[PDB]
Design a protein around this ligand. Structure first.
Ligand SMILES: Nc1ncnc2c1ncn2[C@@H]1O[C@H](COP(=O)(O)OP(=O)(O)OP(=O)(O)O)[C@@H](O)[C@H]1O
Ligand SMILES: Nc1ncnc2c1ncn2[C@@H]1O[C@H](COP(=O)(O)OP(=O)(O)OP(=O)(O)O)[C@@H](O)[C@H]1O
Ligand SMILES: Nc1ncnc2c1ncn2[C@@H]1O[C@H](COP(=O)(O)OP(=O)(O)OP(=O)(O)O)[C@@H](O)[C@H]1O
Ligand SMILES: Nc1ncnc2c1ncn2[C@@H]1O[C@H](COP(=O)(O)OP(=O)(O)OP(=O)(O)O)[C@@H](O)[C@H]1O
Ligand SMILES: [Mg+2]
Ligand SMILES: [Mg+2]
Ligand SMILES: [Mg+2]
Ligand SMILES: [Mg+2]
Ligand SMILES: [Mg+2]
Ligand SMILES: [N+]
Lengths: 408, 408, 409, 408
């Protein structure tokens, strides 16, 4: 059976959204000489997303998507909170018509103001789901079945597509069995009754071991349940929370599963993305990931809450937007599901924050410097939130690995 | 959010299937010395599937699919219970390997025997979800948006696909709302939260009106639940029962909905396919369906319980197999969701028995006559068993239609 | 281990061809521009072929190809010996510059003359390896595997190609082994070391029985060896005599082979094509063939010795040209190797004359009638000559087939 | 007028093949001493092939190809005699069921034994007729018409395909004709009655001079005739000995022919590949070639007698296997027919051992190192055995070119 709400998304959820922005458009103090009293400057992700949600009506016009974060000036990433507006071709102010040129400052409910930054930006197509790696290193070999262990970054293959093993997780409800976590597009086939996963390839392709089958997956969680707020005025707003849980099979040796992210080391617990924390603790932070296509790479969290409006009137959100450092691409086709791990803040081990999303528009390009060409951007989703909606707890040590084995 | 059996539901259901056959296996009880003790001749559908499921190993050995029905000797259909074994190309025994030659009589549990027929038979692919080929008539004209009412046969369209409305159904339990029934592949999309239906076209493709959204759908149901017995030795056995229920929108005029099959007339309640009934009460019966692609097309039921072992070790079952009578096709691409109705024979109401299926093993060909080329066949889903899973009831009179809409 | 003749064999043959055609010109004493005696009109295929070979200079210049036969006038065959000239698009005289145009009569060596008929012509692409056979009748079903026996018309398949069993034959010399004849393109693959035949499909494509492997075949024969005469001025002229002989394996049930042409009946021995015989005894004759692809069709022998000069100065000849009757096609793709058989006209048994060639770039369209579209033509290899160069003998009665098995060494 | 062996001769050869291995199986008496002795280890390439031909049943199980040579541990060639088994993907031993896993040692008849090395392998498919993506150097320009002479490496071309001249060879008997040697696919073609050669292009493609026409070619030689022993259990074994001899035209200016392999220098006579000599005489020896597409390239002989069984059932053998140096490619598409030469070790003249084979699977890919991508390999036929079967003799000095041209 499949189910969708009957009267939930009509005149119970839309009127709650129509109530949220109803008040807003009465109690407004224009205050637009361009002085902007600095005590109402955005401080966290929640402030930036609330201003964008209010002014989303004038943001959709002549723009193919928006996001929140810091303003990018001359390629470099500043530490000024701004709303990133993505345009197809960024031209000089003189060649724009007045009704197209975006403002530099936007003020929202309660005088909360922020900057507006235009960024040349484009989307990629869907991956073809059996990609080429093109990274030749001793790590990719280990990741693609040449290693004697299965861990974060190892290639996981369904009957038609393969990706990467994000993390080793265990359930919370009842039997709380132990498995691994990846995104929905790697381990789920709607037109197929079961979803058997293999390492490194399924039997019809080559040699491999049977890892198990998907027990639960999510595709679409609304914005009010994902973030907890109304991220946009569109009543059909969804957050692409693609993730699939595959518990290790009964006739499968779990002792061949390591918890160390090969190429990174021992990692810490999941770091929740708190929408009220200062933006600099997530925006601009140096992250890394270990998948198979691209081995071990490192990048930068450029923006959050990437909003895209598809052909019809449905708003789709994606949580994380990472851009690789040193002009290197952060990921490649086939790194879907990889663990997004923020580099270790001084002492404590690195903590993961997301998994690489693998949907149609999971990758793309955007130009930062005029001296170089466009650079690839990689999209991710909130790990702390996905683990909440999948009832999964991450495993971080090999000793905790043996404890859940005798816990089912 | 989607769920799957944890594993244990499979582990403690696989044994029951093996335990079912192993029991009759140990005491083989041949009871067949070459000549078959008569009377043991299969009598109904259940008898035939029990012989095929017991001999599933040796039948799928050199076969692309099997189905139960009557033997087809020299093109015409007989009244002899047989297991139709589909081969890629039927040739003379003199050029056949002694091991690849299928037998004529197969023993069964307790001595229930039957014949074995060989049919040259092939498959097609997918209808690519927007078919352009169609018939031309005033009926099809009305069904594709020219009619002044919505009913069985009108064109339903998701955001990407074309289809045909099967029947105006009302839910049994719960809200007891009234909507329509069609194929799952017509109504449901994996990578989309909403499943909106329209007539005759979506707002992005052309003009139309909003009918509603899918409230429930079924994709795969196990054989022992769908039929009532283990129909094979493969522990991964499923039935392609793809149906979707779309309740009419709250702001929709039910007055423009009719419970009459345009081109067929007034119909009765659904004829439940009884596995204990004599074979000729469904096999050989002349049926008819009205969709959009082909319109009103009369056919004849040829086989039941079409088995299909894919290249990945999974068994699939499609219930009804229809071949267009008098050297014509029974349906075209886009008729997915039409009502398979039994033609009135002595004055009773034409009772519907199935709905046109959609997918990959959908519309292939088979050779019956020598003087003609291959003839198209069509897959179908058991309407009686589909309604007993979605918990729906078909409406037959416009006066009963208003009683259902007032009980919501 | 293949071999090719030496440059001496070429220059010896080369000058030999130059000498023959040269002495024709050296005494010509060209004639008056008036009447020609009826007694000197072309009478045989050899007359038409000699006149065409003499004027090969002015014929290949503005033509796709040429052939010998009767003049097609207003879409019908006449009794006028003529040299068919094939053009891509036949237009009125007013739109051709006189150098492009063609004369009505050609006068060959020795006062022998004939007509010149212009025909609109076109070639097709390559045969489809695995073609479509949309005939759908009981004869085709039996020819493709549903028959208890195997004979002329049965589908013979290599590991990647479908074909048609031409005739049950036996070798004249050697060990007198019994086999079957077919087209070379159907049964011969050169990038592979053996040519195994199967009826109806090879193991990698479906059920079937292993008939045997190709024991010998011929691709090209020179015109002076095939026709016996010099048919063209080009010293690089060859006849596409594509045939393959496949003797049944050491352990194959020959009792399942019949020498009956299903749909035609009992046939007689091969009707040899005599180049010095009258033209009407092969040109215009009604013929038939039983081919897997198209079943049993009937046609008309429209021309003979079809010439075609490719882009590298090589001249190629195909023997028979057949067009189906009643605006119908005579063959489809996959009928390659089917036995072209003269229909009985006065009680005699139907005797074959050729096999359908079916390869590289055979088959195409032919503009006969203006109110209709272009009709399909089909090429063929002279059966009488193909057996002479393959040293084969056609078996025509199942009684001769029984004894021919015992006469093997 | 082609001719093939009478099926009487085929059955006789198959019986002798079963009698050869039937003798090796009747005696046997393995009595393996556990780890086995060290003087019973193979030394010659004749002993390596007989171990593979004996164990060809178990080797074919899950191997696309096999080849004798040295064991490649960790990415490079060791001095251990081993039979290289080729797989599609080298996965760890833990992800392989014991039926598919390969043993490390194999003992054959007489107590001889050698190792087994697994190599990741793939075939490049059929190359191009008129190939592109070739090098640019003054050496390449001379080989493609810009030089005033023609010799080894010069561009020879039929009317459809390109290639290179292997060696200036003359017939041992007959008219003692003088010509050149090249690959069979480069020169000959089925659907023509004449194979005329040109340099650098045929008249239809561009400028060039008529060199000659193919007088003889051998398509396939059986392994018992080529090697002198049965190299496989399958009764259909053939060696891809594809060579052709093209004697110069009677009018061609033979003074423009040079016996100097431009790039290598003055070469010596053919180095017959002794099968009963220690493996280090061929395996590991550095080789070189002068082409056109690729020019002067060096390489390393990696294996011998590369066995490839297709899905139809035929076994095919290729003599020489060479990969490129410095992780480069040994040749490009278009180098078919160029003479492979053993580089001088002791300052002696270079000895040609093989010629580049130009059939469908003439090139391919294989992985050696984990930190780098897969390298390209090239096929070749035994030159000494090719000249023996074609009844030809290589000319190594321009003085012998005049002594050979006068004897005609
Ligand atoms: N709708 C639009 N479409 C295209 N270009 C636009 C649009 N609105 C503004 N721009 C361009 O973008 C400029 C503002 O870009 P942005 O806000 O990113 O500037 P910045 O961060 O101060 O500097 P930098 O461009 O170096 O990052 C405008 O001056 C104009 O040239
Ligand atoms: N695996 C197979 N693949 C292909 N053909 C087969 C196979 N097994 C049997 N056959 C062929 O099919 C025949 C059986 O046909 P079938 O059981 O349908 O007979 P029928 O119904 O009496 O007659 P008909 O097929 O003429 O309607 C066998 O005699 C043989 O020629
Ligand atoms: N080189 C040429 N290319 C195209 N058309 C030509 C050429 N030479 C002649 N023709 C045309 O073909 C005509 C000759 O027709 P043809 O030889 O078929 O005679 P016919 O049999 O009496 O007539 P038809 O068959 O056309 O009724 C010329 O009158 C001229 O119009
Ligand atoms: N059928 C197979 N398919 C893929 N890999 C296999 C197969 N059988 C064995 N292997 C792999 O090959 C390994 C054996 O090593 P191999 O034969 O390559 O020797 P080696 O050259 O000394 O080793 P290395 O690969 O470290 O250089 C096994 O440990 C296993 O990982
Ligand atoms: Mg900027
Ligand atoms: Mg039958
Ligand atoms: Mg004419
Ligand atoms: Mg005409
Ligand atoms: Mg190795
Ligand atoms: N032998």
């Amino acid at each position: 059976y499949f189910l969708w709400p009957t009267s939930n998304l009509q005149h119970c959820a839309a009127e709650g959204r129509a109530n949220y922005f109803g008040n807003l458009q009465k109690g407004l103090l224009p205050r637009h000489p361009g002085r902007l009293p600095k005590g109402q400057q955005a401080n966290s992700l929640l402030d930036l997303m609330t201003i964008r949600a209010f002014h989303s009506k004038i943001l959709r016009r002549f723009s193919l998507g928006t996001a929140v974060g810091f303003r990018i000036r001359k390629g470099d990433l500043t530490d000024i909170p701004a709303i990133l507006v993505f345009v197809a071709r960024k031209v000089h102010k003189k060649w724009l018509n007045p009704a197209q040129c975006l403002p530099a400052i936007l003020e929202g409910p309660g005088g909360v103001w922020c900057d507006v930054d235009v960024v040349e930006f484009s989307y990629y197509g869907a991956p073809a789901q059996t990609p080429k790696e093109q990274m030749f290193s001793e790590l990719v070999d280990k990741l693609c079945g040449s290693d004697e262990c299965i861990g974060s970054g190892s290639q996981v293959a369904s009957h038609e597509t393969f990706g990467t093993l994000g993390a080793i997780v265990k359930r919370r409800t009842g039997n709380k069995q132990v498995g691994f976590l990846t995104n929905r597009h790697v381990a789920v086939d709607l037109d197929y009754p079961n979803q058997k996963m293999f390492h490194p390839l399924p039997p019809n392709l080559g040699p491999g071991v049977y890892l198990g089958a998907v027990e639960r997956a999510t595709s679409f969680i609304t914005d009010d349940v994902w973030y907890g707020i109304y991220a946009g005025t569109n009543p059909e707003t969804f957050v692409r929370a693609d993730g699939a849980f595959i518990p290790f099979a009964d006739d499968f040796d779990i002792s061949t599963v390591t918890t160390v992210v090969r190429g990174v080391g021992d990692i810490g617990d999941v770091k929740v993305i708190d929408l009220q924390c200062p933006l600099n603790s997530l925006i601009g932070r140096q992250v890394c990931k270990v998948g198979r296509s691209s081995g071990h790479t490192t990048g930068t969290v450029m923006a959050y809450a990437l909003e895209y409006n598809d052909e019809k009137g449905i708003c789709f959100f994606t949580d994380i937007l990472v851009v690789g450092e040193n002009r290197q691409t952060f990921d490649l086709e086939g790194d879907s599901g990889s663990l997004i791990i923020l580099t270790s803040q001084d002492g404590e081990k690195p903590r993961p924050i997301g998994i690489i999303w693998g949907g149609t528009a999971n990758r793309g390009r955007l130009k930062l410097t005029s001296d170089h060409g466009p650079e690839n951007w990689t999209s991710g989703v909130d790990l702390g939130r996905l683990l909440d909606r999948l009832e999964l707890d991450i495993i971080i040590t090999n000793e905790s690995l043996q404890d859940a084995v005798q816990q089912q």
